[PDB]
mmCIF file of C-alpha atoms and ligand atoms in Angstrom:
data_model
loop_
_atom_site.group_PDB
_atom_site.id
_atom_site.type_symbol
_atom_site.label_atom_id
_atom_site.label_comp_id
_atom_site.label_asym_id
_atom_site.label_seq_id
_atom_site.Cartn_x
_atom_site.Cartn_y
_atom_site.Cartn_z
ATOM 1 C CA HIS A 1288 5.338 -2.813 -22.621
ATOM 2 C CA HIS A 1289 2.359 -4.019 -20.582
ATOM 3 C CA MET A 1290 2.867 -5.609 -17.226
ATOM 4 C CA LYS A 1291 1.008 -6.270 -14.012
ATOM 5 C CA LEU A 1292 1.792 -4.885 -10.644
ATOM 6 C CA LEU A 1293 0.936 -7.305 -7.889
ATOM 7 C CA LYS A 1294 0.620 -5.799 -4.444
ATOM 8 C CA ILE A 1295 0.412 -7.906 -1.295
ATOM 9 C CA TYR A 1296 -0.358 -6.528 2.155
ATOM 10 C CA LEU A 1297 0.147 -8.621 5.244
ATOM 11 C CA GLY A 1298 1.223 -8.221 8.900
ATOM 12 C CA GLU A 1299 4.818 -8.490 10.041
ATOM 13 C CA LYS A 1300 3.749 -10.992 12.777
ATOM 14 C CA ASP A 1301 2.154 -13.344 10.169
ATOM 15 C CA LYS A 1302 3.975 -16.702 10.112
ATOM 16 C CA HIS A 1303 4.456 -19.588 7.716
ATOM 17 C CA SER A 1304 5.818 -22.639 9.539
ATOM 18 C CA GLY A 1305 6.706 -20.509 12.565
ATOM 19 C CA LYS A 1306 8.874 -18.257 10.262
ATOM 20 C CA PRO A 1307 8.055 -14.768 8.898
ATOM 21 C CA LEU A 1308 5.555 -14.973 6.030
ATOM 22 C CA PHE A 1309 6.830 -11.958 4.168
ATOM 23 C CA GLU A 1310 10.313 -13.508 4.013
ATOM 24 C CA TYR A 1311 8.763 -16.723 2.802
ATOM 25 C CA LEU A 1312 6.869 -14.801 0.070
ATOM 26 C CA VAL A 1313 9.984 -13.005 -1.113
ATOM 27 C CA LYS A 1314 11.776 -16.317 -1.207
ATOM 28 C CA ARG A 1315 9.047 -18.031 -3.288
ATOM 29 C CA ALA A 1316 9.062 -15.020 -5.585
ATOM 30 C CA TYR A 1317 12.763 -15.547 -6.113
ATOM 31 C CA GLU A 1318 12.492 -19.333 -6.585
ATOM 32 C CA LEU A 1319 9.778 -18.903 -9.262
ATOM 33 C CA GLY A 1320 11.953 -16.612 -11.394
ATOM 34 C CA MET A 1321 10.058 -13.330 -10.781
ATOM 35 C CA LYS A 1322 11.679 -10.283 -12.300
ATOM 36 C CA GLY A 1323 11.848 -8.648 -8.922
ATOM 37 C CA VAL A 1324 10.312 -7.626 -5.680
ATOM 38 C CA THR A 1325 10.264 -4.627 -3.457
ATOM 39 C CA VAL A 1326 9.309 -4.839 0.221
ATOM 40 C CA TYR A 1327 8.081 -1.967 2.404
ATOM 41 C CA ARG A 1328 7.249 -1.586 6.036
ATOM 42 C CA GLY A 1329 4.422 0.746 7.075
ATOM 43 C CA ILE A 1330 4.009 2.704 10.219
ATOM 44 C CA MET A 1331 0.290 2.007 10.774
ATOM 45 C CA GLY A 1332 -2.530 -0.070 9.288
ATOM 46 C CA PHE A 1333 -5.722 -2.048 9.720
ATOM 47 C CA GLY A 1334 -7.619 -4.612 7.628
ATOM 48 C CA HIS A 1335 -10.574 -7.090 7.734
ATOM 49 C CA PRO A 1336 3.597 -3.917 17.352
ATOM 50 C CA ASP A 1337 2.360 -5.581 14.150
ATOM 51 C CA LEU A 1338 3.204 -3.273 11.317
ATOM 52 C CA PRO A 1339 2.079 -3.631 7.720
ATOM 53 C CA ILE A 1340 4.444 -5.342 5.293
ATOM 54 C CA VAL A 1341 3.804 -4.629 1.597
ATOM 55 C CA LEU A 1342 5.341 -6.479 -1.359
ATOM 56 C CA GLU A 1343 5.310 -5.122 -4.864
ATOM 57 C CA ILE A 1344 6.122 -7.323 -7.869
ATOM 58 C CA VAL A 1345 6.080 -6.017 -11.454
ATOM 59 C CA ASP A 1346 6.048 -8.896 -13.920
ATOM 60 C CA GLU A 1347 4.392 -10.531 -16.863
ATOM 61 C CA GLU A 1348 0.769 -11.441 -16.186
ATOM 62 C CA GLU A 1349 1.563 -15.164 -16.613
ATOM 63 C CA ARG A 1350 4.160 -14.942 -13.862
ATOM 64 C CA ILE A 1351 1.927 -13.009 -11.446
ATOM 65 C CA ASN A 1352 -0.736 -15.618 -12.100
ATOM 66 C CA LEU A 1353 1.645 -18.439 -11.280
ATOM 67 C CA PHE A 1354 2.600 -16.745 -8.041
ATOM 68 C CA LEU A 1355 -1.108 -16.231 -7.259
ATOM 69 C CA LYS A 1356 -1.582 -20.010 -7.496
ATOM 70 C CA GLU A 1357 1.023 -20.476 -4.697
ATOM 71 C CA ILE A 1358 -0.338 -17.710 -2.519
ATOM 72 C CA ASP A 1359 -3.710 -19.541 -2.669
ATOM 73 C CA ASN A 1360 -2.529 -22.467 -0.513
ATOM 74 C CA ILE A 1361 -1.509 -19.958 2.231
ATOM 75 C CA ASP A 1362 -3.912 -18.729 4.934
ATOM 76 C CA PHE A 1363 -3.155 -15.093 5.836
ATOM 77 C CA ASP A 1364 -5.607 -12.151 5.858
ATOM 78 C CA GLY A 1365 -4.268 -8.850 4.462
ATOM 79 C CA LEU A 1366 -4.970 -7.954 0.839
ATOM 80 C CA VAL A 1367 -3.839 -8.842 -2.702
ATOM 81 C CA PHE A 1368 -4.422 -6.800 -5.795
ATOM 82 C CA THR A 1369 -3.175 -6.408 -9.307
ATOM 83 C CA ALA A 1370 -3.127 -3.434 -11.679
ATOM 84 C CA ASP A 1371 -1.943 -2.787 -15.218
ATOM 85 C CA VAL A 1372 1.227 -0.815 -15.657
ATOM 86 C CA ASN A 1373 3.461 0.173 -18.478
ATOM 87 C CA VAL A 1374 7.110 -0.595 -17.965
ATOM 88 C CA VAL A 1375 9.581 1.701 -19.726
ATOM 89 C CA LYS A 1376 12.890 0.123 -21.007
ATOM 90 C CA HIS B 174 -8.548 14.783 -13.894
ATOM 91 C CA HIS B 175 -6.299 12.245 -15.624
ATOM 92 C CA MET B 176 -2.675 11.976 -14.706
ATOM 93 C CA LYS B 177 0.181 9.516 -14.836
ATOM 94 C CA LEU B 178 1.955 7.988 -11.938
ATOM 95 C CA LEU B 179 5.590 7.351 -12.687
ATOM 96 C CA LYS B 180 7.314 4.896 -10.398
ATOM 97 C CA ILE B 181 11.079 4.426 -10.354
ATOM 98 C CA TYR B 182 12.872 1.689 -8.436
ATOM 99 C CA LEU B 183 16.605 1.778 -7.947
ATOM 100 C CA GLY B 184 19.231 0.833 -5.322
ATOM 101 C CA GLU B 185 20.400 3.203 -2.616
ATOM 102 C CA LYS B 186 24.065 2.452 -3.562
ATOM 103 C CA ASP B 187 23.463 3.516 -7.220
ATOM 104 C CA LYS B 188 25.585 6.574 -8.085
ATOM 105 C CA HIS B 189 25.549 9.384 -10.616
ATOM 106 C CA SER B 190 28.925 11.137 -10.729
ATOM 107 C CA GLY B 191 29.969 9.467 -7.473
ATOM 108 C CA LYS B 192 26.833 10.989 -5.763
ATOM 109 C CA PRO B 193 23.555 9.235 -4.821
ATOM 110 C CA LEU B 194 21.375 8.668 -7.893
ATOM 111 C CA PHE B 195 18.074 8.948 -6.102
ATOM 112 C CA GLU B 196 19.036 12.417 -4.839
ATOM 113 C CA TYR B 197 20.065 13.343 -8.346
ATOM 114 C CA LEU B 198 16.673 12.130 -9.678
ATOM 115 C CA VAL B 199 14.724 14.114 -7.111
ATOM 116 C CA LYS B 200 16.787 17.143 -7.984
ATOM 117 C CA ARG B 201 16.158 16.808 -11.754
ATOM 118 C CA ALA B 202 12.482 16.320 -10.986
ATOM 119 C CA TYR B 203 12.519 19.611 -9.136
ATOM 120 C CA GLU B 204 14.521 21.471 -11.813
ATOM 121 C CA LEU B 205 12.083 20.348 -14.554
ATOM 122 C CA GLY B 206 9.055 21.782 -12.738
ATOM 123 C CA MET B 207 7.412 18.468 -11.710
ATOM 124 C CA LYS B 208 4.368 18.848 -9.517
ATOM 125 C CA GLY B 209 5.974 16.726 -6.865
ATOM 126 C CA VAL B 210 7.805 13.671 -5.756
ATOM 127 C CA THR B 211 7.649 11.207 -2.955
ATOM 128 C CA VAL B 212 10.613 9.014 -2.012
ATOM 129 C CA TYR B 213 10.468 5.736 -0.075
ATOM 130 C CA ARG B 214 13.028 3.363 1.286
ATOM 131 C CA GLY B 215 12.282 -0.372 1.330
ATOM 132 C CA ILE B 216 13.485 -2.995 3.689
ATOM 133 C CA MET B 217 14.237 -5.708 1.102
ATOM 134 C CA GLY B 218 14.296 -6.188 -2.672
ATOM 135 C CA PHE B 219 15.773 -7.820 -5.745
ATOM 136 C CA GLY B 220 15.697 -7.101 -9.490
ATOM 137 C CA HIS B 221 17.242 -8.167 -12.860
ATOM 138 C CA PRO B 222 23.176 -3.103 2.713
ATOM 139 C CA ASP B 223 21.692 -1.850 -0.571
ATOM 140 C CA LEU B 224 18.066 -1.134 0.066
ATOM 141 C CA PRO B 225 15.458 -0.271 -2.539
ATOM 142 C CA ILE B 226 14.720 3.402 -3.148
ATOM 143 C CA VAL B 227 11.377 4.148 -4.836
ATOM 144 C CA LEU B 228 10.289 7.489 -6.313
ATOM 145 C CA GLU B 229 6.710 8.298 -7.128
ATOM 146 C CA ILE B 230 5.780 11.283 -9.311
ATOM 147 C CA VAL B 231 2.171 12.142 -10.201
ATOM 148 C CA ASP B 232 2.060 14.590 -13.094
ATOM 149 C CA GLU B 233 0.745 15.398 -16.514
ATOM 150 C CA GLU B 234 1.729 12.810 -19.111
ATOM 151 C CA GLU B 235 3.760 15.426 -21.035
ATOM 152 C CA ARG B 236 5.842 16.109 -17.943
ATOM 153 C CA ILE B 237 6.436 12.431 -17.119
ATOM 154 C CA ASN B 238 7.482 11.976 -20.728
ATOM 155 C CA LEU B 239 9.966 14.817 -20.501
ATOM 156 C CA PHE B 240 11.451 13.322 -17.366
ATOM 157 C CA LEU B 241 11.620 9.923 -19.112
ATOM 158 C CA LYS B 242 13.793 11.525 -21.808
ATOM 159 C CA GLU B 243 16.345 12.531 -19.104
ATOM 160 C CA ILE B 244 16.259 9.206 -17.319
ATOM 161 C CA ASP B 245 17.186 7.614 -20.688
ATOM 162 C CA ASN B 246 20.736 9.026 -20.691
ATOM 163 C CA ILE B 247 21.327 7.391 -17.250
ATOM 164 C CA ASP B 248 22.582 3.808 -16.830
ATOM 165 C CA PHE B 249 21.024 2.207 -13.728
ATOM 166 C CA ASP B 250 19.117 -1.110 -13.541
ATOM 167 C CA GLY B 251 16.001 -1.120 -11.321
ATOM 168 C CA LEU B 252 12.599 -0.543 -12.906
ATOM 169 C CA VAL B 253 10.438 2.266 -14.336
ATOM 170 C CA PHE B 254 6.732 2.144 -14.908
ATOM 171 C CA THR B 255 3.794 4.399 -15.477
ATOM 172 C CA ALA B 256 0.084 3.988 -14.744
ATOM 173 C CA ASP B 257 -3.037 6.082 -15.212
ATOM 174 C CA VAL B 258 -4.517 7.703 -12.160
ATOM 175 C CA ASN B 259 -7.260 10.118 -11.409
ATOM 176 C CA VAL B 260 -6.264 13.042 -9.259
ATOM 177 C CA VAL B 261 -8.998 14.539 -7.075
ATOM 178 C CA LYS B 262 -8.899 18.373 -6.461
ATOM 179 C CA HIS C 1181 -13.248 -8.137 -8.309
ATOM 180 C CA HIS C 1182 -12.928 -4.444 -9.171
ATOM 181 C CA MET C 1183 -11.931 -1.956 -6.550
ATOM 182 C CA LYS C 1184 -10.398 1.475 -6.234
ATOM 183 C CA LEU C 1185 -7.129 2.332 -4.665
ATOM 184 C CA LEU C 1186 -7.196 5.721 -3.026
ATOM 185 C CA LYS C 1187 -3.821 7.256 -2.330
ATOM 186 C CA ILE C 1188 -3.373 10.323 -0.140
ATOM 187 C CA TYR C 1189 -0.106 12.209 0.260
ATOM 188 C CA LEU C 1190 0.336 14.785 2.970
ATOM 189 C CA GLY C 1191 3.054 16.117 5.319
ATOM 190 C CA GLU C 1192 3.707 14.679 8.756
ATOM 191 C CA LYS C 1193 3.558 18.233 10.255
ATOM 192 C CA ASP C 1194 0.027 18.818 8.821
ATOM 193 C CA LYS C 1195 -2.499 19.292 11.648
ATOM 194 C CA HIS C 1196 -6.233 18.966 12.154
ATOM 195 C CA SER C 1197 -7.315 20.711 15.358
ATOM 196 C CA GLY C 1198 -3.701 20.931 16.530
ATOM 197 C CA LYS C 1199 -3.426 17.073 16.192
ATOM 198 C CA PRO C 1200 -1.696 15.048 13.434
ATOM 199 C CA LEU C 1201 -3.797 14.988 10.257
ATOM 200 C CA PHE C 1202 -2.685 11.581 9.101
ATOM 201 C CA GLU C 1203 -3.850 10.063 12.401
ATOM 202 C CA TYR C 1204 -7.126 11.889 12.014
ATOM 203 C CA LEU C 1205 -7.507 10.484 8.460
ATOM 204 C CA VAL C 1206 -6.818 6.932 9.569
ATOM 205 C CA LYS C 1207 -9.334 7.379 12.338
ATOM 206 C CA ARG C 1208 -12.075 8.681 9.990
ATOM 207 C CA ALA C 1209 -11.287 5.805 7.655
ATOM 208 C CA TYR C 1210 -11.915 3.422 10.516
ATOM 209 C CA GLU C 1211 -15.101 5.171 11.709
ATOM 210 C CA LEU C 1212 -16.604 5.048 8.182
ATOM 211 C CA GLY C 1213 -16.188 1.269 7.910
ATOM 212 C CA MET C 1214 -13.360 1.214 5.315
ATOM 213 C CA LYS C 1215 -11.988 -2.218 4.571
ATOM 214 C CA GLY C 1216 -8.543 -1.092 5.559
ATOM 215 C CA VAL C 1217 -5.705 1.325 5.420
ATOM 216 C CA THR C 1218 -1.984 1.220 5.122
ATOM 217 C CA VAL C 1219 0.220 4.142 6.164
ATOM 218 C CA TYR C 1220 3.780 4.816 4.985
ATOM 219 C CA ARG C 1221 6.409 7.342 5.847
ATOM 220 C CA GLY C 1222 8.764 8.595 3.130
ATOM 221 C CA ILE C 1223 12.284 9.788 3.418
ATOM 222 C CA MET C 1224 11.999 12.801 1.080
ATOM 223 C CA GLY C 1225 9.368 14.696 -0.909
ATOM 224 C CA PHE C 1226 8.049 17.934 -2.346
ATOM 225 C CA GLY C 1227 4.683 19.126 -3.687
ATOM 226 C CA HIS C 1228 2.780 22.264 -4.875
ATOM 227 C CA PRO C 1229 11.898 17.606 9.215
ATOM 228 C CA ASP C 1230 8.511 17.270 7.492
ATOM 229 C CA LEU C 1231 8.442 13.896 5.856
ATOM 230 C CA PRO C 1232 5.792 12.609 3.477
ATOM 231 C CA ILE C 1233 2.989 10.503 4.931
ATOM 232 C CA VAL C 1234 1.102 8.325 2.427
ATOM 233 C CA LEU C 1235 -2.178 6.487 3.052
ATOM 234 C CA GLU C 1236 -3.433 3.725 0.834
ATOM 235 C CA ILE C 1237 -7.033 2.486 1.023
ATOM 236 C CA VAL C 1238 -8.379 -0.292 -1.219
ATOM 237 C CA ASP C 1239 -12.170 -0.343 -1.148
ATOM 238 C CA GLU C 1240 -15.378 -0.273 -3.091
ATOM 239 C CA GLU C 1241 -15.741 2.858 -5.207
ATOM 240 C CA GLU C 1242 -18.817 3.933 -3.193
ATOM 241 C CA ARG C 1243 -16.775 3.852 -0.001
ATOM 242 C CA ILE C 1244 -13.806 5.760 -1.452
ATOM 243 C CA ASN C 1245 -16.294 8.322 -2.707
ATOM 244 C CA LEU C 1246 -17.823 8.710 0.728
ATOM 245 C CA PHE C 1247 -14.399 9.229 2.238
ATOM 246 C CA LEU C 1248 -13.618 11.777 -0.506
ATOM 247 C CA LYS C 1249 -16.652 13.790 0.634
ATOM 248 C CA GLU C 1250 -15.100 14.072 4.148
ATOM 249 C CA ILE C 1251 -11.627 14.879 2.909
ATOM 250 C CA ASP C 1252 -13.219 17.807 1.001
ATOM 251 C CA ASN C 1253 -13.995 19.805 4.164
ATOM 252 C CA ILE C 1254 -10.274 19.585 5.147
ATOM 253 C CA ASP C 1255 -7.658 22.119 3.997
ATOM 254 C CA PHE C 1256 -4.289 20.399 3.445
ATOM 255 C CA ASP C 1257 -2.122 20.504 0.289
ATOM 256 C CA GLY C 1258 -0.487 17.197 -0.725
ATOM 257 C CA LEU C 1259 -2.189 15.012 -3.322
ATOM 258 C CA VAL C 1260 -5.133 12.604 -3.694
ATOM 259 C CA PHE C 1261 -5.618 10.100 -6.445
ATOM 260 C CA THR C 1262 -7.569 7.006 -7.261
ATOM 261 C CA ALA C 1263 -6.858 4.082 -9.588
ATOM 262 C CA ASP C 1264 -8.636 0.886 -10.574
ATOM 263 C CA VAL C 1265 -7.327 -2.340 -9.155
ATOM 264 C CA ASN C 1266 -8.345 -5.929 -9.139
ATOM 265 C CA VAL C 1267 -8.478 -7.533 -5.737
ATOM 266 C CA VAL C 1268 -7.806 -11.277 -5.609
ATOM 267 C CA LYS C 1269 -9.732 -13.350 -2.950
HETATM 268 N N1 ADP D 1597 -8.259 -2.638 2.288
HETATM 269 C C1 ADP D 1597 -6.990 -2.343 2.642
HETATM 270 N N2 ADP D 1597 -6.328 -1.194 2.241
HETATM 271 C C2 ADP D 1597 -5.047 -0.867 2.595
HETATM 272 N N3 ADP D 1597 -4.307 -1.695 3.408
HETATM 273 C C3 ADP D 1597 -4.926 -2.830 3.818
HETATM 274 C C4 ADP D 1597 -6.265 -3.186 3.454
HETATM 275 N N4 ADP D 1597 -6.605 -4.374 4.001
HETATM 276 C C5 ADP D 1597 -5.502 -4.741 4.704
HETATM 277 N N5 ADP D 1597 -4.474 -3.808 4.579
HETATM 278 C C6 ADP D 1597 -3.148 -3.872 5.184
HETATM 279 O O1 ADP D 1597 -2.836 -5.208 5.554
HETATM 280 C C7 ADP D 1597 -2.481 -5.263 6.923
HETATM 281 C C8 ADP D 1597 -2.725 -6.679 7.359
HETATM 282 O O2 ADP D 1597 -4.096 -6.849 7.255
HETATM 283 P P1 ADP D 1597 -5.043 -7.677 8.244
HETATM 284 O O3 ADP D 1597 -4.380 -8.956 8.375
HETATM 285 O O4 ADP D 1597 -6.348 -7.961 7.524
HETATM 286 O O5 ADP D 1597 -5.237 -7.309 9.759
HETATM 287 P P2 ADP D 1597 -5.123 -6.184 10.888
HETATM 288 O O6 ADP D 1597 -6.389 -5.455 11.193
HETATM 289 O O7 ADP D 1597 -5.024 -7.099 12.163
HETATM 290 O O8 ADP D 1597 -3.834 -5.369 10.686
HETATM 291 C C9 ADP D 1597 -3.317 -4.156 7.554
HETATM 292 O O9 ADP D 1597 -2.946 -3.746 8.844
HETATM 293 C C10 ADP D 1597 -3.133 -3.101 6.497
HETATM 294 O O10 ADP D 1597 -1.922 -2.421 6.599
HETATM 295 N N1 ADP D 1598 10.285 -6.273 -11.176
HETATM 296 C C1 ADP D 1598 10.414 -5.607 -10.008
HETATM 297 N N2 ADP D 1598 9.402 -5.499 -9.068
HETATM 298 C C2 ADP D 1598 9.512 -4.840 -7.874
HETATM 299 N N3 ADP D 1598 10.688 -4.219 -7.517
HETATM 300 C C3 ADP D 1598 11.700 -4.306 -8.416
HETATM 301 C C4 ADP D 1598 11.598 -4.990 -9.670
HETATM 302 N N4 ADP D 1598 12.758 -4.897 -10.356
HETATM 303 C C5 ADP D 1598 13.570 -4.182 -9.535
HETATM 304 N N5 ADP D 1598 12.920 -3.808 -8.360
HETATM 305 C C6 ADP D 1598 13.472 -3.030 -7.256
HETATM 306 O O1 ADP D 1598 14.609 -2.295 -7.688
HETATM 307 C C7 ADP D 1598 15.719 -2.584 -6.860
HETATM 308 C C8 ADP D 1598 16.940 -2.259 -7.673
HETATM 309 O O2 ADP D 1598 16.922 -3.170 -8.716
HETATM 310 P P1 ADP D 1598 18.182 -3.904 -9.376
HETATM 311 O O3 ADP D 1598 19.108 -2.828 -9.656
HETATM 312 O O4 ADP D 1598 17.758 -4.446 -10.730
HETATM 313 O O5 ADP D 1598 19.123 -4.881 -8.583
HETATM 314 P P2 ADP D 1598 19.298 -5.831 -7.311
HETATM 315 O O6 ADP D 1598 19.037 -7.280 -7.556
HETATM 316 O O7 ADP D 1598 20.867 -5.851 -7.211
HETATM 317 O O8 ADP D 1598 18.669 -5.168 -6.074
HETATM 318 C C9 ADP D 1598 15.488 -4.033 -6.448
HETATM 319 O O9 ADP D 1598 16.246 -4.505 -5.364
HETATM 320 C C10 ADP D 1598 14.010 -3.960 -6.177
HETATM 321 O O10 ADP D 1598 13.700 -3.420 -4.931
HETATM 322 N N1 ADP D 1599 2.681 15.336 -7.488
HETATM 323 C C1 ADP D 1599 3.175 14.607 -6.465
HETATM 324 N N2 ADP D 1599 3.806 13.385 -6.627
HETATM 325 C C2 ADP D 1599 4.325 12.633 -5.607
HETATM 326 N N3 ADP D 1599 4.250 13.066 -4.303
HETATM 327 C C3 ADP D 1599 3.637 14.261 -4.110
HETATM 328 C C4 ADP D 1599 3.088 15.056 -5.166
HETATM 329 N N4 ADP D 1599 2.533 16.184 -4.671
HETATM 330 C C5 ADP D 1599 2.747 16.096 -3.332
HETATM 331 N N5 ADP D 1599 3.406 14.917 -2.990
HETATM 332 C C6 ADP D 1599 3.793 14.480 -1.652
HETATM 333 O O1 ADP D 1599 3.031 15.165 -0.667
HETATM 334 C C7 ADP D 1599 3.892 15.795 0.263
HETATM 335 C C8 ADP D 1599 3.095 16.908 0.880
HETATM 336 O O2 ADP D 1599 2.855 17.789 -0.162
HETATM 337 P P1 ADP D 1599 2.842 19.388 -0.088
HETATM 338 O O3 ADP D 1599 1.978 19.680 1.035
HETATM 339 O O4 ADP D 1599 2.116 19.913 -1.313
HETATM 340 O O5 ADP D 1599 4.101 20.242 0.301
HETATM 341 P P2 ADP D 1599 5.693 20.298 0.428
HETATM 342 O O6 ADP D 1599 6.404 20.918 -0.728
HETATM 343 O O7 ADP D 1599 5.833 21.455 1.484
HETATM 344 O O8 ADP D 1599 6.220 18.966 0.989
HETATM 345 C C9 ADP D 1599 5.115 16.156 -0.571
HETATM 346 O O9 ADP D 1599 6.278 16.498 0.136
HETATM 347 C C10 ADP D 1599 5.233 14.884 -1.365
HETATM 348 O O10 ADP D 1599 5.853 13.850 -0.668
#
């Protein structure tokens, strides 16, 4: 059963409306009906103390795409990628 | 050198025989002769304080499959997926 | 936009010139002009307290390859793999 993994990297100090962006992302994920999310905190990072936050979502491609369309209206740096995975039931 | 990544997401409060399921998984992994395992703890998650636990195993497909056959007899929710990776020697 | 994910697993107690190897890796990554790195610490692991350290780099294949050529001169155990991902802009 084919799915996409969506991985989002951002900083903990990143804000949306003064409030933590990663919390806002997890909350949009939930409001959109995503199957789930897992959030990690790193110990070190750089892109281009403010620690990496990483979200992983495994969902149907259509759902990841819908979420991507929301993420688009948000200015943060970090990184977004997807990858194909096979979910086992 | 082709391998599979197997990724398992579960809750920290999940139990097998009253004892922590993630510890039981790591222990089966070891008893089966898996090449390795890495275990992470998240800071937030949801599916469908109890924090996400994630296991990653990179191994031969045959081995991941054998492990899958054990995981099948266990009732937990969470998520299991595999993905192709290329291991460098 | 195709990229590679490079994932490196090593122990926290691993050393390069008496100094922590993971810090040395992150520092080479930066000196080579990698697009970024994210570093995680696990809670448990085995291969074949010394906790897993995991680095993730998402970059152009050419860059990951160049980094691989440096990693080659270093003796540590752990694990290195790559995987194809699609970065969204
Ligand atoms: N190419 C990448 N590979 C792995 N992690 C990355 C990459 N790009 C960004 N990240 C992660 O995202 C975090 C946030 O990125 P970024 O905002 O661009 O800025 P910064 O350099 O100030 O941390 C980084 O610190 C890093 O952990
Ligand atoms: N589709 C998913 N994507 C990313 N992480 C997931 C997904 N599904 C489940 N998880 C992770 O697995 C954890 C355990 O899942 P679950 O048992 O289904 O219940 P819960 O909602 O009570 O946390 C979740 O909290 C989450 O971290
Ligand atoms: N096949 C693997 N799958 C997942 N993680 C691995 C794998 N191989 C190694 N690792 C991670 O790398 C860490 C360092 O590996 P290793 O040096 O080989 O020795 P050790 O058994 O002494 O921890 C492991 O503890 C583990 O977290």
